[PDB]
């Protein structure tokens, strides 16, 4: 069984500029003449999506700006220039022997100046509490890089409990990331307090991104 | 995507068995070998099955030999895959690909499926409860407006959030709660389209049979 190792198992490029991913076989996938090396794209929520095969052969529609080589045991998948759309994770296969076991997969990320997010805030609806529970949900939009902490108050007082956090896919046009944080609440705990505050730190500031709501106005 | 439709992706208790199937549309199976491949909710992707275009020669992955049946009907135009002594970690979406034709040995995946959704569980179908997010009644409105539904409670995976049919969505990943998942999706729209104008969010959950509609009214 011919073991396939990729190399690096993840990476960031700057659009423009180049994303060189190794696969590395265990044993020989040359013979006939040729190479039987693959490799496929997979974006999340797609099937995936052959680019190159046999080593170097460009599959029909995939652009020019993807590029394969090498030989026998040492194969690169080169995109040049990375573009925005090239967010996904690259896999390399064989066929020289069987089984066709991928190699573990490369994840792109593209690389793009460091950006805050924006705080949007929403109260259970009426729906919700009508049928007794309470979630209370902010998203933190379009920001750079991935990380980032959300912190949840109701009535001035930080709340631990309770709390999910979702992130997004990298977008593939802007290269930012979003995510949810979701408080879940009983309606009985929800209806006994007055203002409830999502605070978002991001390393691309000190100071919090707050944003809130009141229950006792309108 | 459109020239092969992989069906029979279903909830499966432990230890039972499923049969998948793949139709080709537009294209024929005939002189091709072919392949079944997985993506699981997170191991790498993975290939588990081929046949030759004559069917007297298959091979499988180690994690499904012994398990599973690779099969075919070129007169019908059909890839199978028999499963049996299902495992929680045969949790995963299905797709299948034919091979390239090319001579000289071996080939590439060329044309892939869809995929169809299998989950191996003890847990029960659930249908989703669809809670719009809407901005609360202090919002200081700004040019443009965020808004979102959170689709909470539903078992298996997935779900497909469509508003207003056929941009500015995010779709934030499905999490696992107490066996049942939740997700949401949000779209974002100019102050003077909304409420002005219809916003409404339609969540398809396909093992329930499901389509919960939200229209988004100003809180």
């Known amino acids: 069984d011919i073991v396939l190792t990729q190399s690096p198992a993840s990476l960031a490029v700057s659009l423009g500029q180049r994303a060189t991913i190794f696969c590395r076989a265990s044993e020989t996938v040359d013979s006939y003449g040729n190479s039987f090396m693959h490799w496929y794209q997979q974006k999340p929520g797609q099937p995936p999506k052959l680019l190159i095969y046999?080593?170097?052969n460009l599959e029909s529609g995939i652009p020019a700006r993807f590029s394969g080589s090498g030989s026998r045991t040492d194969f690169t998948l080169t995109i040049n220039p990375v573009e925005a759309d090239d967010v996904a994770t690259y896999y390399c296969q064989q066929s020289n022997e069987d089984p066709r076991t991928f190699g573990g997969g490369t994840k792109l990320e593209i690389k793009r100046a460091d950006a805050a997010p924006t705080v949007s805030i929403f109260p259970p609806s009426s729906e919700q509490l009508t049928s007794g529970g309470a979630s209370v949900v902010c998203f933190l939009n379009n920001f750079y890089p991935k990380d980032i902490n959300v912190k949840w108050k109701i009535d001035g007082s930080e709340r631990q409990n309770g709390v999910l956090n979702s992130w997004t896919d990298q977008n593939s046009k802007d290269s930012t990331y979003s995510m949810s944080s979701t408080l879940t609440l009983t309606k009985d705990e929800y209806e006994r307090h007055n203002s409830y505050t999502c605070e978002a730190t991001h390393k691309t500031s000190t100071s919090p991104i707050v944003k809130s709501f009141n229950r006792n106005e309108c | 995507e459109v020239q092969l439709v992989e069906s029979g992706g279903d909830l499966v208790k432990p230890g039972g068995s499923l049969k998948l199937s793949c139709a080709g549309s537009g294209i024929t199976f005939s002189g091709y070998g072919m392949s079944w491949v997985r993506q699981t909710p997170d191991k790498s992707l993975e290939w588990v099955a081929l046949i030759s275009n004559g069917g007297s020669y298959a091979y499988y992955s180690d994690s499904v030999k012994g398990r599973f049946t690779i099969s075919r009907d070129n007169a019908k135009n059909t890839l199978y895959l028999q499963m049996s002594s299902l495992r929680s970690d045969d949790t995963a979406i299905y797709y299948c690909?034919?091979?390239?034709?090319?001579?000289?040995?071996?080939?590439?995946?060329?044309?892939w499926g869809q995929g169809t959704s299998v989950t191996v569980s003890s847990a029960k179908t659930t249908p989703p409860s669809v809670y719009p997010l809407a901005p609360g009644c202090g919002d200081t409105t700004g040019s443009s407006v965020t808004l979102g539904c959170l689709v909470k409670g539903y078992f298996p995976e997935s779900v497909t959030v469509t508003w207003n049919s056929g941009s500015s969505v995010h779709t934030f990943p499905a999490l696992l709660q107490s066996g049942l998942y939740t997700m949401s999706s949000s779209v974002t729209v100019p102050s003077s389209t909304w409420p002005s104008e219809t916003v409404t969010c339609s969540v398809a959950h396909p093992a329930s049979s499901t389509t919960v509609d939200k229209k988004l009214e100003p809180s």
């Open positions: 690909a034919r091979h390239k034709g090319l001579r000289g040995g071996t080939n590439a995946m060329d044309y």
């Open positions: 046999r080593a170097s």
